Design a protein around this ligand. Structure first.
Ligand SMILES: [Mg+2]
Ligand SMILES: [Mg+2]
Ligand SMILES: [Mg+2]
Ligand SMILES: [Mg+2]
Ligand SMILES: [Mg+2]
Ligand SMILES: [Mg+2]
Ligand SMILES: [Mg+2]
Ligand SMILES: [Mg+2]
Ligand SMILES: [Mg+2]
Ligand SMILES: [Mg+2]
Ligand SMILES: [Mg+2]
Ligand SMILES: [Mg+2]
Ligand SMILES: [Mg+2]
Ligand SMILES: [Mg+2]
Length: 62
RNA sequence: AGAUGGUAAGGGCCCACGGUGGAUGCCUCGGCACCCGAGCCGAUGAAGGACGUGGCUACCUGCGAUAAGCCAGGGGGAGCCGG
């Protein structure tokens, strides 16, 4: 389900949409690096975090 | 004075049981022929590729930095994150 709650308001992100969507896409991309960094060091990441964070940015990126 | 036994280093034929080898039978995811259908793609970048892409990924498959995937419509009704 996750998606709906998000993707719905992701469109609703039409307050300052495209611009806020760029800003948003970045924070989502920084959180990703932090993740692959912590996953890099070994015990400090638990999988799906990255997958879900990726696919999020993909629709987020629309 | 004479006469004729035994020995098998090894060999040979036969029997039994194995080793090696992959014939024979059965099998079939594939192939073959015919018939019917269907018949163009490309600068809106084709055909075909290269390098990438998974939390751990050698290869195959998929995909393309939104990267085994994103959106929506339809199908479907308990399982799902390919091999
Ligand atoms: Mg989805
Ligand atoms: Mg005598
Ligand atoms: Mg005698
Ligand atoms: Mg003998
Ligand atoms: Mg002897
Ligand atoms: Mg002997
Ligand atoms: Mg025996
Ligand atoms: Mg034999
Ligand atoms: Mg034999
Ligand atoms: Mg066949
Ligand atoms: Mg043309
Ligand atoms: Mg191609
Ligand atoms: Mg590949
Ligand atoms: Mg697909």
């Amino acid at each position: 389900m996750k998606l709906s709650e998000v993707r719905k308001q992701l469109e609703e992100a039409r307050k300052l949409s495209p611009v806020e969507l760029e800003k948003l896409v970045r924070e989502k991309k920084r959180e990703l690096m932090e993740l692959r960094f912590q996953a890099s060091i070994g015990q400090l990441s638990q999988n799906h975090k990255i997958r879900d964070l990726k696919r999020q940015i993909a629709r987020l990126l629309t």
